[PDB]
């Protein structure tokens, strides 16, 4: 069993050209420690969801997409603790009919916790978390407190290591 809940947050500047590019990509990788894992133990990582983050009064509206370096499960040996991880999150601009996830208010940046997540949690944890996250994001609630509500679900009896983001965009105009 592992059972920490474990966190590592990156910066993403959207490039001042984005507008003209229509284009960026990022890659970031991470390794994790779990001092908590007993015996051997697998790590999933939860199938991602693109994000639609809205900035500046959501005049702008961009479409993340977040997909696993490596989508596998992660195997660890007896008494293993450590792994690594890491994602790449492509952005667009979004449609413009859009519904915005996460909104910067009047501003240009947004913290966005849990933008790609893994959890030592059984399937059937991992699975009904999964469902209720997206059910709870269709359903009015913050990004964020959707994310926690799963994260605490995950969490239980189980460990779970996220990835968050801040991201920034200062258009050329």
């Given at each position: 069993a592992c059972y920490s809940e474990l966190s590592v947050q990156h910066n993403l500047v959207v490039q001042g050209d984005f507008a003209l590019t229509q284009t960026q990509m990022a890659t970031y990788e991470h390794n994790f420690n779990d001092s908590?894992?007993?015996?051997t133990n697998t790590i999933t990582p939860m199938s991602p969801s693109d994000i639609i983050v809205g900035l500046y009064n959501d005049t702008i509206k961009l479409n993340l997409h977040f997909e696993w370096t490596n989508k596998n499960n992660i195997t660890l040996s007896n008494n293993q603790t450590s792994f690594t991880s890491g994602y790449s999150v492509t952005v667009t601009p979004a449609a413009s009919n859009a519904k915005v996830n996460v909104s910067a208010g009047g501003g240009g940046s947004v913290m966005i916790n849990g933008v790609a997540t893994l959890s030592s949690a059984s399937s059937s944890t991992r699975g009904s978390a999964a469902v209720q996250f997206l059910l709870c994001l269709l359903g009015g609630k913050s990004w964020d407190a959707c994310v926690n509500s799963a994260r605490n679900a995950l969490a239980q009896n189980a460990g779970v290591y996220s990835f968050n983001l801040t991201l920034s965009y200062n258009p050329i105009t």
């Open positions: 908590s894992c007993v015996s």
